[PDB]
């Protein structure tokens, strides 16, 4: 109903912690009311990139800790 206020986090590189003790990095592009995250893709936590931009389901998200301050 209320939007997740990620307008601070816009166009910044964020470590998006997902299910299964995995982590996703990448710079933010957009979001919706279900907290699904569209972002330009980065590497998966030795380290490796798959894809140009990735779209994350909201249910997978443990947290999203920003790399830039």
């Amino acid at each position: 109903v209320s939007t997740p206020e990620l307008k601070k986090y816009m166009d910044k590189k964020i470590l998006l912690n997902i299910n299964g003790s995995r982590k996703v990095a990448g710079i933010l592009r957009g979001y919706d009311i279900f907290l699904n995250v569209v972002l330009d893709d980065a590497m998966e936590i030795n380290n490796h990139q798959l894809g140009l931009q990735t779209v994350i389901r909201g249910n997978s998200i443990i947290s999203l800790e920003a790399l830039d301050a």
């Binding site: 816009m10 997902i18 299910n19 299964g20 995995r22 996703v24 592009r29 957009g30 979001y31 919706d32 279900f34 699904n36 995250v37 569209v38 893709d41 798959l50 894809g51 140009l52 931009q53 990735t54 779209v55 994350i56 389901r57 249910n59 997978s60």
Partner: protein
């Protein structure tokens, strides 16, 4: 701002290889092309490929995958 509702719509008209991961299931991944779009995240993804995760390839057909088990979408 590119929303995730609109972002899947562009993937359907692009017909490019997508790699989908599975929710609370690390070792198995799905690689195919997005065909469907629903009000939820549920899609049909034809000519997909199951991939065992490096800690190769397996045969697999055309599949709709239930959106609750989606983790990543990238295309």
């Amino acid at each position: 701002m590119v929303p995730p509702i609109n972002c899947i719509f562009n993937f359907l008209q692009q017909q490019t290889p997508v790699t989908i991961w599975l929710f609370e299931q690390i070792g198995i991944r799905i690689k195919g092309k997005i065909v469907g779009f629903d009000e939820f995240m549920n899609v049909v993804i034809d000519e997909a490929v199951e991939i065992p995760v490096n800690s190769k390839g397996t045969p697999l057909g055309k599949i709709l995958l239930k959106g609750d088990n989606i983790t990543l979408i990238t295309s």
